Amino acid sequence: GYFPVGVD
């Protein structure tokens, strides 16, 4: 849910 979009 962090950067970049896709990483958790």
Residue 8 structure tokens: 């958790």
| 5 backbone dihedrals φ, ψ, rounded to 5° | -60, 110
**DSSP conformation letters of the chain:** --SSTT--
Quick one: tokens of 5?
A: 């979009």
State the method: NMR
Please report, as a single letter, which amino acid is at residue 4: P
| Tokens, residue 2 | 């962090």
